[PDB]
Design a protein around this ligand. Structure first.
Ligand SMILES: [Mg+2]
Ligand SMILES: [Mg+2]
Ligand SMILES: [Mg+2]
Ligand SMILES: [Mg+2]
Ligand SMILES: [Mg+2]
Ligand SMILES: [Mg+2]
Ligand SMILES: [Mg+2]
Ligand SMILES: [Mg+2]
Ligand SMILES: [Mg+2]
Ligand SMILES: [Mg+2]
Ligand SMILES: [Mg+2]
Ligand SMILES: [Mg+2]
Ligand SMILES: [Mg+2]
Ligand SMILES: [Mg+2]
Ligand SMILES: [Mg+2]
Ligand SMILES: [Mg+2]
Ligand SMILES: [Mg+2]
Ligand SMILES: [Mg+2]
Ligand SMILES: [Mg+2]
Ligand SMILES: [Mg+2]
Ligand SMILES: [Mg+2]
Ligand SMILES: [Mg+2]
Ligand SMILES: [Mg+2]
Ligand SMILES: [Mg+2]
Ligand SMILES: [Mg+2]
Ligand SMILES: [Mg+2]
Ligand SMILES: [Mg+2]
Ligand SMILES: [Mg+2]
Ligand SMILES: [Mg+2]
Ligand SMILES: [Mg+2]
Ligand SMILES: [Mg+2]
Ligand SMILES: [Mg+2]
Ligand SMILES: [Mg+2]
Ligand SMILES: [Mg+2]
Ligand SMILES: [Mg+2]
Ligand SMILES: [Mg+2]
Ligand SMILES: [Mg+2]
Ligand SMILES: [Mg+2]
Ligand SMILES: [Mg+2]
Ligand SMILES: [Mg+2]
Ligand SMILES: [Mg+2]
Ligand SMILES: [Mg+2]
Ligand SMILES: [Mg+2]
Ligand SMILES: [Mg+2]
Ligand SMILES: [Mg+2]
Ligand SMILES: [Mg+2]
Ligand SMILES: [Mg+2]
Ligand SMILES: [Mg+2]
Ligand SMILES: [Mg+2]
Ligand SMILES: [Mg+2]
Ligand SMILES: [Mg+2]
Ligand SMILES: [Mg+2]
Ligand SMILES: [Mg+2]
Ligand SMILES: [Mg+2]
Ligand SMILES: [Mg+2]
Lengths: 137, 125
RNA sequence: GGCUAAUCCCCCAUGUGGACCCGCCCCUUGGGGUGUGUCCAAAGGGCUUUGCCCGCUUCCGGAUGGGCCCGCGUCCCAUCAGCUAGUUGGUGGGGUAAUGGCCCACCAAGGCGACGACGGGUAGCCGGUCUGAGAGGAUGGCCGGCCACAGGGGCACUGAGACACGGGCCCCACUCCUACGGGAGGCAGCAGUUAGGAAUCUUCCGCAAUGGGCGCAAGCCUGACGGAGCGACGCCGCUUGGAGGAAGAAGCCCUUCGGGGUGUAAACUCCUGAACCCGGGACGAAACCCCCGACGAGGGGACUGACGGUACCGGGGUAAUAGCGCCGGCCAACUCCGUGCCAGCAGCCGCGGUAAUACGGAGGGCGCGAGCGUUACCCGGAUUCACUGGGCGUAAAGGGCGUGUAGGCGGCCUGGGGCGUCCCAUGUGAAAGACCACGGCUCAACCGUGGGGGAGCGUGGGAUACGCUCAGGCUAGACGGUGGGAGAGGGUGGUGGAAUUCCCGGAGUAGCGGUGAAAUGCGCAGAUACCGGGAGGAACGCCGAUGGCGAAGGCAGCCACCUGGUCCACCCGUGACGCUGAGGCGCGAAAGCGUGGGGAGCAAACCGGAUUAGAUACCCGGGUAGUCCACGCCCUAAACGAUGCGCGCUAGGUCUCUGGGUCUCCUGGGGGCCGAAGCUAACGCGUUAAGCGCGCCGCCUGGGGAGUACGGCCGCAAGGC
RNA sequence: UUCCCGGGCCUUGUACACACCGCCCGUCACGCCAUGGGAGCGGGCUCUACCCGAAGUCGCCGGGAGCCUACGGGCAGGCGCCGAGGGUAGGGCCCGUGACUGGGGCGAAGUCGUAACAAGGUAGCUGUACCGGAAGGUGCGGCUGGA
């Protein structure tokens, strides 16, 4: 691994593209805060701490849409798109005046502040900003 | 590339070439002609296009096209070089302005006569 | 040569104070104070006078301006890779207002450079301006700030300040005056002349306002400045009329000749009224001046305009310039006539060789309008340099392969710092430009006033999620340990047989080889075919393949030695030791090169004989280097899976190679096929990804010229990069 | 139903699509354009070493030779270093030009041959070496962009 957060979000993406019930990402505190935000906004059904072969993983329980009708009956995604911004090769840091609109407020930019790991609206209300981790919509 | 390769090397700008070497950006170059003759174009066409090889004030000696129907250009005519190439004529990258120095305008031309350099007539009108 | 005056010079005196050495104290790199010793000041002038005003000298403080130094940013060429003699540092001096290697002596040998030194080319820089959705790209004209120059170059003096446009000295070049021997000059100041060039103006008015210098003031100087003149050079505003007006005059164009278009367009009727005529006529201007008041504050009075009789106001009053580009698709506008690959048009596609909406004209229509087109340059479209925002299997592109330096990136838990990062406050970010609002020119252009923040950087305070560092700990990453496994992995030495060729011996005949058919050729000098023996060299049949090994090239009889890589099981130890990798280094098919050896078969070049019109080829017979070995070079390729490496995720079915097991079966590594989701322009890929993501390196920016030329490096050369 | 001529269906290959009476390659001949090498010629920029070296700051002398307003001092003058620039000699870089020569590109429809595209009539391509008017042929090894 080089960036464990991009590995976690890519594993969540590949889980959403095949409509799996749950997957296992490695356990970290920062990953747990990201999954806390993804559970508070309603992109997943929540997480739990599990131990696979004595080694701590995380059961990310996936959320999907209603089973559609007509051809291609795969349901619409909850997580249509997820992409890391602040790469370990190219770090991104923004201020409070520099927090983007994300699909006209429909999406979210999870970003890391000095007051903890926050969202785009919580970094505007508190007025802090920081390292812009990823976008989810 | 990667981000580090863009730090170590960066991007390369375009650095184009001017198609008109008329000495440091002059829109017009005065010149005295040397040889006035007719040439033949490329295969897709067939005509006798009127040209003149002009020795001009930048030290260059280029060939230019003579537009219009008929001209008064000779071995020692002082012309003005405009710019722009002729596609069917290789080597010709220039035009001769009419209505200046020694290149008079097209006689009896009335529709498009600013280009080709002809005065307004007056047929009691 | 001789007088002579000063706010000119010099000497003596006092010393608030200042300077210098020494010592001490505070501060702490030359700041402040103190004691002894020493040194250093001056100038008068004018009135309404023994009272002021302008001046003088020393010092301290303030304001403004400036010198010097430092952090960061600032074009292209790596076909510029090594640069450095005062060069780098110290000590003592000189010089400066002042640090400084600025300069000079002595000592040391350092200093800079892939984070791009040195060199070459180009360029004044910035606020800003143009474009662009933004990010960016381009640019530095007018205005403002800084720099540097005043024909080229060098130098000092006066001076608070200059290395000094209109000051000085010298050398070179140019012009002019010379009685020839020695003198004057420096428009890149405002006009203006000449040359160059596509191109850039008036040898105008005034100090009336602002500002600068001198002077107590009156006042004087100011080509700064305020204006006027010229150029559609740009922008803005206005005019060449408006309302009526024939089922629609004439001319002209088209016509299926009945008609349609120009076209309310025109002529014609009413009306307003540009330009012109008359009269008036300024804002910009109020101080400095004078009087009262103590020439203070305050009040009052008087003089002064270039622009200019100009803007403007009032009355009268005339129908009064329109042109330019286009009309095939982009792209808006269609017919006729002339021409007929001719004349010609053209930004691309491309038209014209007889019926052209593309050439030329006419009618008409379109787009602008005192402008319209063309040319030159910048941005855009160009997401064709992709940070935003591109790609590399086949279109351009994965380095031939590995090791590995710098660099880039990096697993889990808990603390300290708070550097990156974030927040707040404060200072700066000049003015002008841009944005918004309100106003002044009758609008606008132009201008004024007010407000609002950008970005960056200094300082203070606060936060620790992430990146960083320090410290403690953990094991999934990586490596090791133990016990095994498979393999054409590599090097050295030895060895077995089949087969080919040659030599010898026996026997044996009139043909053998060869082709599509022939021929050259070999053969009664006893061939081919048969047997026996001997010599020599090269490659290893069957096993043996859709197989295995290796990083690639590549590796295949067998045996022995030396040796690397790799896989499984046990989960034993270290404990983040990891991944990639610009250079460098090593390996690197075949052909080729050098030295020596060897040479049976094959076989470039060469020689024949056929085919063919011709054969420098294909076919056949000979045949030299080479193919083989040792050592040293050469570094190329369809070196290909045309797919770089490492890691994590994402249905499976099936064949096979190799371990382990609790052997219907499960698990690990590897080699193939079909295929979920997904990707691709398609072919196709598909856990051996070309899918989903991260880290790093290499590479691409239309084809040809061209992997060519020049330069550099390597090679004996061919040649390679 | 092997052969020659014409034809129908399927499949494979193509660089053909005015469609094999297709396309296309290279040498030679003529003209033009740009360019490399080239005995050399001319010019510009720059570096090093030395010789001469004005004005001028600075450092000594200021004396058998001057002038002074305060003299164990000053001015003039003299000597020395640096010194713009001029000269000499040798390098480096760049630009134009040069008899001749190599190859590139475009032209009018030229001459010779058949290389490649279909098994293009010897499968093609590539590295290397040799040879041949020329495309090319052959030898070794490699690839499927053919069976
Ligand atoms: Mg005292
Ligand atoms: Mg005294
Ligand atoms: Mg310059
Ligand atoms: Mg753009
Ligand atoms: Mg001059
Ligand atoms: Mg002066
Ligand atoms: Mg002057
Ligand atoms: Mg002229
Ligand atoms: Mg004045
Ligand atoms: Mg004044
Ligand atoms: Mg009217
Ligand atoms: Mg009518
Ligand atoms: Mg009519
Ligand atoms: Mg006034
Ligand atoms: Mg149209
Ligand atoms: Mg047209
Ligand atoms: Mg026409
Ligand atoms: Mg106008
Ligand atoms: Mg762009
Ligand atoms: Mg462009
Ligand atoms: Mg990108
Ligand atoms: Mg692309
Ligand atoms: Mg390719
Ligand atoms: Mg490769
Ligand atoms: Mg490595
Ligand atoms: Mg980390
Ligand atoms: Mg910090
Ligand atoms: Mg400002
Ligand atoms: Mg640690
Ligand atoms: Mg253990
Ligand atoms: Mg090799
Ligand atoms: Mg070899
Ligand atoms: Mg050899
Ligand atoms: Mg020998
Ligand atoms: Mg043979
Ligand atoms: Mg024949
Ligand atoms: Mg014959
Ligand atoms: Mg043979
Ligand atoms: Mg292969
Ligand atoms: Mg497998
Ligand atoms: Mg497949
Ligand atoms: Mg090209
Ligand atoms: Mg080559
Ligand atoms: Mg049938
Ligand atoms: Mg043919
Ligand atoms: Mg030539
Ligand atoms: Mg040459
Ligand atoms: Mg030469
Ligand atoms: Mg000569
Ligand atoms: Mg022929
Ligand atoms: Mg052929
Ligand atoms: Mg063939
Ligand atoms: Mg062939
Ligand atoms: Mg041959
Ligand atoms: Mg072969």
């Amino acid at each position: 691994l080089t960036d464990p957060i991009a590995d976690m979000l890519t594993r969540i993406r590949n889980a959403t593209r095949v409509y799996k019930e749950s997957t296992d990402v490695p356990a970290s505190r920062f990953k747990e805060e990201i999954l806390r935000i993804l559970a508070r906004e309603g992109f997943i059904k929540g997480y739990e701490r599990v131990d696979v072969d004595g080694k701590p993983y995380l059961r990310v329980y996936l959320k999907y849409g209603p089973r559609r009708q007509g051809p291609d009956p795969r349901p619409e995604q909850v997580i249509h798109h997820i992409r890391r911004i602040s790469k370990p090769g190219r770090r991104v840091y923004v201020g409070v005046k520099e927090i983007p609109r994300v699909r006209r407020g429909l999406g979210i930019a999870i970003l890391s502040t000095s007051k903890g790991v926050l969202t785009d609206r919580e970094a505007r209300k508190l007025g802090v900003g920081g390292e812009l981790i990823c976008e989810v919509w | 590339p990667t981000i580090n390769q863009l730090v170590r090397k960066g991007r390369e700008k375009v650095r184009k070439k001017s198609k008109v070497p008329a000495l440091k950006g002059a829109p017009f170059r005065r010149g005295v002609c040397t040889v006035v003759r007719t040439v033949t174009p490329k295969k897709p066409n067939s005509a006798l296009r009127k040209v003149a090889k002009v020795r001009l004030t930048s030290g260059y000696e280029v060939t230019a096209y003579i537009p219009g129907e008929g001209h008064n250009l000779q071995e020692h005519s002082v012309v003005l070089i405009r710019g722009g190439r002729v596609k069917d004529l290789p080597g010709v990258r220039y035009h001769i302005v009419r209505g200046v120095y020694d290149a008079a305008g097209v006689k009896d031309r009335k529709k498009s006569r600013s280009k080709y350099g002809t005065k307004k007539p007056k047929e009691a009108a």
